[PDB]
Structures are given as C-alpha cells and as structure tokens.
Design a protein around this ligand. Structure first.
Ligand SMILES: Nc1nc2c(ncn2[C@@H]2O[C@H](COP(=O)(O)CP(=O)(O)OP(=O)(O)O)[C@@H](O)[C@H]2O)c(=O)[nH]1
Ligand SMILES: Nc1nc2c(ncn2[C@@H]2O[C@H](COP(=O)(O)OP(=O)(O)OP(=O)(O)O)[C@@H](O)[C@H]2O)c(=O)[nH]1
Ligand SMILES: [Mg+2]
Ligand SMILES: [Mg+2]
Lengths: 426, 410, 277
C-alpha cells in the first residue's frame, strides 16, 4: 500500500510541486487541509502517499533532496509548499554545482542522512509499504546526483518495496543545461541499478505534444511538469484504486520487464485535447488507443514507429467495457504486427481502474517499453563522449571530489545498457 | 439430499449473488425470508462487501461471508499458498459447520473463476481440503474459464493451468466457461458491445448455477457432483470439460423465448454458444452432461438427444457406447431482475470434455503460449505467488486435456 | 581453420549412498567414444572417459593439446559442465582418484612451463594469471601459479550436491594469459587460456537459477563492471561462441539421477557442433 516519493534535485523538485499539486486534488487534500474529497473512494487507499498524525493533516510522504536552498525555498514558499513536514526537506546549502559529483558526493551526501531519517519516518508510517515514487531531472547538480543517491540508499533499506522512477531525460533538439550528459549519464547509471520501474519523460517531446496536441501557445514549465505529473498519477495512485482488472507497480513491472536491465518506458496520457473547442468527447475508447499509440503523444523524444515494443501497459481509469478494451488492444496489435515484437497475440498488458481523473470521463495512461528507448541512451551516451573526450566541464566535478574513472564507469554501464536493449530488438 | 455451495473469488461471488438471486425469485422467498446454504470467500473485502451492502444483504449470515481484508493478487501462488492459506481453515470451518447442520447431504459446489487470484489459487486448496475431508461426496465445481481471446488478467493462464492441475484430482467436472469464446455470445447472442466484466460473471454465474445450485437441488433426474467426474472424465488427467448454456437470448431485443427443448438442445452444439473459443463444427466429439432445468419432458429429451446422436457431423465417443448424461431439474432458470439475460422457462447447461472446446481449449491454450513464450507475464505472478513451475506445469496439464478431449472421441 | 568444439564425457564412480543403497552402474561404454544409457540412443563424443580412467589419463585426453595451441599463439578454453557432484571440481582442479578433467588446473601449470623451460634463450615468455569467482551472484576477484591457485581456491564459495568433497557455489574461472615474444625477430604472440569450473546444471535460489539461465539464454548485457559479467559467461568459450574450446561434461552413473545425466549428455551432444555466431 504505502509509497515514498523522492524529489531529487531542482527539476525533480519543481515537478514534485506539480506531482503533488495534482495528486492531492486527485485525493481532495488541500494545502494543510484534509480530505475534502468530492467522493469517499479517494480516501480508502490514500495511505500510499500520506501519513496520519493530526486528523486533517495527511502529509505527503516524499523526500526533498537538493543542494540549492533557493529551490526548495520556492517550493516551500509558494502554493502547496506548506504541506510537507519540514523534516522532509533534506537541503544542502553547499554549492549545488552543476557537476555529477556535487549533489551526490560533496554537498548532497551531507543532507542525505537528514533525508533517510524522514524516508523512514514515512515508511514506518503504518500498514504495509509498496514502494516509493521518485521525480527528478537527470540534467542537474542535485537530482541526477542527490536524488540518484536517495534511491541507492532507499534500495539498501528495503530491497523489497518497489521503486518507480520518473526521470526527465535530457531532451534532444535543445538542452536546458550544458553539462546535461554529465549529470545524466551519471544518474541513469544509478537508475539501471536500483529503481525497478522508470518512466522517462522528454522536455521538448512535451513542448511538441503540448503546443500541437494542446494548441497551447505559451507552454510554461509549470505546464510541462503538470502534463508529466498527470501520467505518474495514472500509473501509481490510480492502480491503487479499484478496477475490473487492476494492477499495481509489481503488475506493471512483472508484466513490462522481460530482461533485468530495468528498461525504461515512455509514458503517454489519453485524453489530450485542447480546452474549449477540441472537447470533442471522442473518447468512446478507440479514441484513447488512437491517441496513446500514435507517435506524437509519447512523452519520450524517440518515436515508437522507429522500433518494436516489448511490452505495453494501457492503464485505463474510467468505466468501460472489458470487451471494447480487451478488443481494441488486439486490432492495435495486428494493424501494427510490424512493430510490436514477435509475440503479437500479446505485448499489451491491459489494466483497468474504475474512477477516472477527477474531472474527466475516461482516460488511460500508457507505459511503453519500446526497445526504442535504445535510441535515447545512445543520444545521451554520445553527447558524453564528444565532450568527455575533452574533459569539457570536468573540473567542476573532480574539483568536487570525483574520479576520472567514475565518469568512465557510468558511460560504459549506461552505454552497455544500450547494447543489451538491442539484444531483443533482434 | 441437500448441498452446500462455495462461491470463491470476486467473480464466483458476483455470479453467486446472481445465481443466488434467481433462486429466491422462483421460490417466493423475498429479501428477508429463510436461510441460504452456502458461503462466500474472497481476499479482497470490497467485493464480498457488495453482498454486505447491496441487494440480498440480510439473506446471509455474516458467518457464511468470509473475507481476508488483506490482498487478493491476481496470482495463484499468493492466493493458494502464502496468503490464501491463512483463511482456508476458517473457510473450511463453515463448510464443516454448514455441512453438519444439514441432513445427509450430497456435495459441495465450487463457484470459481479459473483465471483469478482468489478464484484459482484458494479454491485449489479448498477443493483440495474437501476431497480429503469428504471424499465420500460430490464435488461439482462450476467454473468460468478464460475467454478464448478476450481474457483480462495478463497472467490468466498461469492462474488457470494451476487451478486445473490442483483441482483435477479432487474432482474435476469443472465446467469451464471462457467469455473470449463466449463474450462473443454477448455480441453475437445478446447484442452488446458494452459487456462489463460484471456480465461475463453473470453468465458463468448462470452456467455455474446449473451445476451445483439446482443440481444439488431435487429433480426428476438428479445428478450428484461425483456423478460428473464419473460420467464426465474418461481418464485421471483432471480432464477439463467445457461449459455451455442454451437460452442465451436477449431480454429486450428478440423474443421467441418459447423455444421448446428440441431447440435449446440443438443450440448447445453449435460452436457459437459455448463459453470457450467457438469453432468445433456442429458439435464434434465427447461425454456430455446435459443438465436441463425447468419444464422438460424426459421423452422430449430422450428424443432431442436421439436426434442428435444421429447427426453424425457431431461425431462422438470412442470405446464406450453412449456419452449423454441427462440431468433434469425442476425449477426453471433465473435472471438478474434487469441485467440482459432473456429469462426463459427452461435451459440447457451442457458441459463436456470434447465438444467445440475441444477446439475452445486449444484456441485458449495457444493464446497462453504466445505470451508465456519465454515466461511472458511471469513476473506478474512471481512477485505475487508463483514460479516458472506453476505456469509451465499447468500448461503441460491442459496439454493432456487437448489429447483427452481428442482421444475420448474422433 | 573452422574447427569444432570438442566434448569429452567423464562419468564418476558410484558414491557411498548409491553404492550403499545398492544402485547399479547404468552406463555402458563401447569403443573409446560412445556411451549408452539402457536401450536408448548411444551418445558419441570426442572421447568418453569411464570412472576408471586416471586423472593423468583424463588430462592427456582433454587439456594436453589445448596447452600446445595456446603456446602456438591460439586461445584455448576448457570448462567442466555438470550436475553438482558429478565431478566438475574433481576434474577441473581437485584431488586424485578418478577420471579426466583430472587436475586440469595444476596439470596445466606444469605442462605450460615444462614447455617454456625447454625453449631457447630468446623469445621471452610472459604469463599472468587471473583467478575470479561466481558471476550469478556478486563477482569476486609453475610454483608462482600454484601459490595463486591455492590463494584463489581458498576464497571460492563451497557448495555440495552428492556424496562428494567441497561442493561449489560460484562459477570459478581461472584465466591464463600466455604472452610470447621472439627477442631477435621481435615477432610477438599471445593467447588467453580460460579454465572454467561451471556451477550445477540441475533444474528461491532455484527460481533465481532458472531466471539466470533464461536471461543468459537470450544473451546478457555487454558490460565489463557490475552484474553483467558472470556465470554462463566465463565458461563461455567452453561451450559455444569460441576458440580452441574443449568441454568436459560430467555425469553420475547412478540411475537415481538418470534424468539430469540425460540432460547433460544432451548439452555436450548439442554443443559438439557449436554453431557459434
Ligand atoms: N518539464 C520540466 N523540466 C525542468 C523543470 N525545471 C527544470 N527542468 C529541467 O531539469 C534540468 C535542470 O534541472 P533542475 O532545476 O532540476 C536542477 P536541480 O534543481 O535538481 O539541481 P541543482 O544543480 O542543485 O540546481 C533541465 O533539463 C531543466 O531543463 C520543470 O519545472 N519542468
Ligand atoms: N461473455 C462474457 N465474457 C466475459 C464478460 N466479462 C468478462 N468476460 C471474459 O472473462 C475474461 C476476463 O476475466 P477477468 O475478469 O480479467 O478475470 P476473472 O475471471 O475475473 O478472474 P480474476 O483474474 O481473479 O479477476 C475475458 O477474457 C472475457 O472473455 C462478459 O460480460 N460476458
Ligand atoms: Mg536547483
Ligand atoms: Mg475479477
């Protein structure tokens, strides 16, 4: 049942604010308020993300790890910012340098113990813990570093409970940072070896999907974040709801990972229509699979159409026919037999909740494991070498107590990770 | 004389609430009358709660409603072994406390849903613990086998190759109904592209009612649970017959309802009506246990069947002569006050080992492989309660159910 | 050269219990290359060594020529595949009292050097060993060689499967990298000599073992540091995809194991051709 989110770095943090902004409303929890829940079902399973103390104060059970005060001091000084128990804030007032050796070895390493402390206060909350949700970006000093540490510790403390990771892998076209592949390659490394379910969401893949699939002309970050947080809610929290056929982290993992690498997915939301007009309601269902399974609409950068799938998990959440669901999935599996890897009569783990996204009639989160994500770690891995070769901004790492063999390690590891994934595309 | 019935798994419970409804409905015993004669098991409270919150609320004793607040888990292992274990004792206790109170009973009933967690696993050991505590009775289990193409759970087969092998030696005669080949029934014989899982359950929830419920109920040609396995399995392999129902007509659309026996019986062998793929040609090879219920004249049967025995395109049984166990009950069948089931005054829940499934079985087995193809959705059961064993070893199981239904005929 | 993977078959003798519980020597040897199990299919191998062939004997039959090629500048692998307590560690390193893959390890050390010592002053030889253990789990890193083997063995996991002595828990791999360079001419030569002792082949540590074999069956990552880099990987050149490789499948004669033995006799048989990629 229980769950413990982890906001590593600024990004992973910024997103925390959006993941919790959402989720709460999808659970009727006002800032410090309690359960105003329009219904009574948005409560029997909350535990997964909160804790009982007062009686109106169900506090999010997440961790906020970061070596840059200003950040958490923006998330804690704004809207829902005053719901996290201060104990949750594991800051590192140090210099949150943009190096993959600052928020993981020098500055973050200190703030860690004051985090694990809480991650235990929340885990030992009550009932039975399932796993922890982790949001962050693999392109910054804390985050890919400090958040990637938070897990390496979590996975030593409860190698039983699961670990879903929501990573904002460095978008292609333009990088919102410079060392990006440094902070990234270094964090993916930690991921491929601790968390056991990762949902990679691209930034520019979002813009696109947010500027053409939502005529939205000024897609602020808040938005992107908001869209992402929309998917991670469909995944976890959702399945912790009833359903004709419900699953749960485990079900998504034991049905999505054919080979231990850990493999990375690419989340996709269902009703993604522009506000007014578009409100076509063409959501009978063929419309959702129409959506989810198209190229654009995959939070990832790469396009599915560029590589088979190993597994797929349409985690729908809104009253529908186990027939029009189970059925559609099929044609889909046959119209595209081409790309869907050898097991046609399958490769589509159908999941079905009941209650939908608060204000919507019918939605369906998509979690695709398309060997396609090979063509992303490739990207990342490339950027590294092209700059590692010249040790570009390496002094900001080493000078922070790092190793010339550390970077080697990660790249290789994550680089091999690319290799393996191909072992199935063939 | 009397029986009990154990509705296991959310489904077996939904179907249970249904079969249990039709009952009072044709016995003049409203909401609050006598006292049932069964129990309800599930490792997910919210579902048995539906019997505790919804209709037919006070017609049960909070004692014949077993729940394990814990976790269901769509995996046999966790249900059979690990979790499901904890409850079993308690479960049994009722089927030993309810089995005592009566007067010379005839058998148990298992209403379960083959491919579930609480339905596959649990029962597996429930029927298991029964075959030993009352080997001297009938164990007719009314199942709702995996839809031939429209399954739900990702693992389903793991859970159904495992409930078959463990229950086989305890009694088989496990009716087996798969919406996949049936669900089509809801689209070809009832018309509705809106079939909620709550429907396929109402259906098996029907075919099953024909197994235990009514059969353990007096009639003009009673058939005990033992009867099944005896008249239904030619060989020790926990042989898997297929469940089929006849008047699966829509309670809205068409209305020819008054479809004398001569019709409803022929409607069983056409492959498009057997809750299991659907394509075994006319009927096609078997031991069949034609359980009828409602107003039926034994000659009507001992004629309607005669006509069949000579259709040849329905090519039957081997070494032994005659494979038609005619089971006649009195009380006609029931229907969810307002679901979508016609509501006739006679039906035929025929379940054999060959018939169209027969093909159905294979068309459902093949499915499995494709996915298992390399463990497939195994990681979904392991973390819940299962090994490469239960899957692979329940596959081999049915394999000899494809050979069985083949040998006993053709 | 397009040469095939050689496969020798060594059967250990009936142990305490088996010879206690009675049991009978189920295999039947005909000629120096075929073995039969009852009325079944007569398996033919590059060589079949009954319980009796001495360890020295088991050597000349397998390892001997391998040592000769690694010095000619070729790479050679030798690995013992078998159902725990079938003889792997007995043949790969072990004590003296049985068939082939006798003392593969120690016997190879001597042969290697006895050859070098006998060559002219020029062409210096550079041998360096690597002794590593258990890939499924956490991988753990003539006299000069024996001192190391002794050090290595010490550290190796200890296992047990059937009235045998110390029964493995890892795939221990002992690598010998023989380098050669003619000082006059200056023309070098080298070759890696993998001597692997595989873990049990028998069917929660058993779900872990089925998961490890399944994963390896479809190929494993290509890493060089962590998890990737282990069992079914070290004695890789000892099975398929390879160099001058030679596998010694070990088998129990007791019928109590008839099955597994048949599973083993099948691996070797299939490996024989070894259609490496
Ligand atoms: N979709 C979104 N991506 C973001 C957001 N904020 C940052 N980012 C992205 O994340 C990376 C930069 O990271 P952060 O703000 O998370 C860095 P973090 O604060 O974790 O650590 P520091 O190095 O201590 O600042 C980069 O790819 C930005 O482009 C956001 O709000 N939404
Ligand atoms: N004819 C018909 N078949 C149905 C209906 N609903 C479901 N089915 C069949 O049942 C299968 C779905 O089973 P699930 O509900 O996933 O599993 P279950 O049988 O409930 O057992 P659990 O796994 O324990 O939930 C599909 O393959 C369908 O073919 C229905 O309303 N009508
Ligand atoms: Mg920051
Ligand atoms: Mg169900």
């Amino acid at each position: 049942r229980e769950i413990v989110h982890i906001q590593a770095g600024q990004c992973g943090n910024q997103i925390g604010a959006k993941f919790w902004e959402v989720i709460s409303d999808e659970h009727g929890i006002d800032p410090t308020g309690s359960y105003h829940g329009d219904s009574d079902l948005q409560l029997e399973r909350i535990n997964v993300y909160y804790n009982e103390a007062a009686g109106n104060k169900y506090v999010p059970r997440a961790i906020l790890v970061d070596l840059e005060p200003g950040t958490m001091d923006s998330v804690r000084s704004g809207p829902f910012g005053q719901i996290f128990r201060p104990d949750n804030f594991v800051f590192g007032q140090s210099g949150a340098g943009n190096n993959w050796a600052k928020g993981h070895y020098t500055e973050g390493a200190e703030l860690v113990d004051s985090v694990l402390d809480v991650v235990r206060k929340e885990s030992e909350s009550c009932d039975c813990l399932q796993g922890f949700q982790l949001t962050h970006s693999l392109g910054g000093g804390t985050g890919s570093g400090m958040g990637t540490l938070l897990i390496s510790k979590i996975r030593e403390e409860y190698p039983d409970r699961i670990m879903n990771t929501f990573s904002v892998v460095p978008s292609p076209k333009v990088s919102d940072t410079v060392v990006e592949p440094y902070n990234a390659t270094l964090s993916v490394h930690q991921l491929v070896e601790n968390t056991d379910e990762t949902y990679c969401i691209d930034n520019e893949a979002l813009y696109d999907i947010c500027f053409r699939t939502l005529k939205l002309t000024t897609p602020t970050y808040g938005d992107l974040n908001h869209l992402v947080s929309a998917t991670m809610s469909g995944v976890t929290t959702c399945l912790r709801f009833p359903g004709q056929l419900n699953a749960d982290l485990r079900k998504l993992a034991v049905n999505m990972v054919p080979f231990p690498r850990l493999h990375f997915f690419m989340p996709g939301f269902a009703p993604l229509t522009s506000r007014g007009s578009q409100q076509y309601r063409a959501l009978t269902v063929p419309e959702l699979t129409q959506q989810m399974f198209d190229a654009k609409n995959m939070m990832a950068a790469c396009d599915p159409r560029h590589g088979r799938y190993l597994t797929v998990a349409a985690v729908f959440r809104g009253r529908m026919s186990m027939k029009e669901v189970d059925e559609q999935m099929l044609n889909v599996q046959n119209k595209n037999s081409s790309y869907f890897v050898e097991w046609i009569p399958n490769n589509v783990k159908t999941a079905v909740c009941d209650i939908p996204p608060r204000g919507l009639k019918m939605s369906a989160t998509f979690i695709g494991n398309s060997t396609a994500i090979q063509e992303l770690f490739k990207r990342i891995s490339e950027q590294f070498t092209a700059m590692f070769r010249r040790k570009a901004f390496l002094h900001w790492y080493t000078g922070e107590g790092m190793d010339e063999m550390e970077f080697t390690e990660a790249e290789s590891n994550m680089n091999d990770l690319v290799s393996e994934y191909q072992q199935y595309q063939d | 004389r009397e029986c009990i019935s154990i509705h296991v798994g959310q489904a077996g419970v939904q179907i249970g609430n249904a079969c249990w409804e039709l009952y009072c409905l044709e016995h003049g015993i409203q909401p609050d009358g006598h006292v049932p004669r069964a129990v309800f098991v599930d490792l997910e409270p919210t579902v048995i709660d539906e019997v505790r919150t919804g209709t037919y609320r006070q017609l049960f004793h909070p004692e014949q409603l077993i729940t394990g607040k814990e976790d269901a888990a769509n995996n046999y292992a966790r249900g059979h072994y690990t979790i499901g274990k904890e409850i079993i004792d308690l479960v049994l206790d009722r089927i030993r406390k309810l089995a005592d109170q009566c007067t010379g009973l005839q058998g148990f009933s298992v209403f379960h849903s083959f491919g579930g967690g609480t339905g596959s696993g649990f029962t597996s050991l429930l029927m298991e613990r029964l075959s030993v505590d009352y080997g001297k009775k009938s164990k007719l289990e009314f199942s709702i086998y995996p839809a031939p193409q429209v399954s739900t759970a990702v693992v389903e087969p793991y859970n159904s190759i495992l409930t078959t092998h463990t229950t086989l030696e305890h009694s088989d005669c496990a009716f087996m109904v798969d919406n996949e080949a049936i669900y089509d029934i809801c689209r070809r014989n009832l018309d509705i592209e809106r079939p909620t899982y709550t429907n396929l359950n109402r259906l098996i929830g029907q075919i099953v009612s024909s197994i235990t419920a009514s059969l353990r109920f007096d009639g003009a040609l009673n058939v005990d649970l033992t009867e099944f396995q005896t008249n239904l399995v030619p060989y020790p392999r926990g042989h898997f017959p297929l469940a089929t129902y006849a008047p699966v007509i829509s309670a809205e659309k068409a209305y020819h309802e008054q479809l004398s026996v001569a019709e409803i019986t022929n409607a069983c062998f056409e492959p498009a009506n057997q809750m299991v793929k659907c394509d075994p040609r006319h009927g096609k090879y078997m031991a069949c246990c034609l359980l009828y219920r409602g107003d039926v004249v034994p000659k009507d049967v001992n004629a309607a069947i005669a006509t069949i025995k000579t259709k040849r395109t329905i090519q039957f049984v081997d070494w032994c002569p005659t494979g038609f166990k005619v089971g006649i009950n009195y009380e006609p069948p029931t229907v969810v006050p307002g679901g979508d089931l016609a509501k006739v005054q006679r039906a035929v829940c025929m379940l054999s080992n060959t018939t169209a499934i027969a093909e159905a079985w294979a068309r459902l087995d093949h499915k499995f492989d494709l996915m298992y193809a390399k463990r497939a959705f195994v990681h979904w059961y392991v973390g819940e309660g299962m090994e490469e064993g239960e899957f692979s070893e329940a596959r081999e199981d049915m394999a000899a159910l494809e050979k069985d239904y083949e040998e006993v005929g053709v | 050269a397009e040469c095939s993977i050689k496969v020798m078959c060594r059967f250990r003798p009936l142990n305490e219990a088996e010879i206690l519980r009675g049991d009978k020597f189920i295999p039947k040897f005909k000629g120096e290359e075929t073995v039969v199990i009852g009325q079944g299919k007569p398996y033919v191998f590059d060589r079949v060594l009954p319980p009796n062939t001495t360890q020295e004997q088991v050597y000349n039959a397998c390892a001997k020529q391998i040592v000769k090629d690694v010095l000619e500048g070729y790479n050679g692998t030798i690995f013992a595949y078998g159902q725990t307590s079938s003889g792997k560690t007995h043949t790969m390193e072990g004590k003296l009292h049985d068939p082939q893959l006798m003392g593969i390890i120690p016997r190879i050390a001597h042969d290697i050097f006895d050859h070098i010592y006998s060559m002219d002053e020029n062409l210096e030889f550079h041998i360096k060993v690597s002794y590593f253990e258990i890939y499924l789990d956490k991988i753990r890193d003539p006299e000069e060689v024996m001192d190391v083997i002794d050090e290595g063995k010490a550290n190796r996991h200890v296992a047990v499967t059937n009235m045998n002595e110390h029964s493995s828990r890892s795939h221990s791999i002992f690598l010998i990298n023989i380098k050669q360079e003619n000082v006059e001419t200056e023309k070098k030569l080298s070759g890696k000599l993998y001597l692997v002792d595989l873990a049990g082949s028998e069917k929660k540590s058993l779900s872990a073992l089925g998961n490890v074999i399944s994963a390896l069956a479809e190929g494993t990552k290509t890493h060089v540091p962590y998890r990737d880099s282990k069992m079914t990987r070290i004695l890789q050149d000892s099975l398929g995809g390879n160099c001058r490789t030679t596998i010694v499948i070990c088998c129990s004669p007791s019928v109590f194991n008839e099955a597994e033995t048949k599973s083993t006799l099948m691996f070797g048989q299939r490996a024989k051709t070894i259609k490496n990629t």
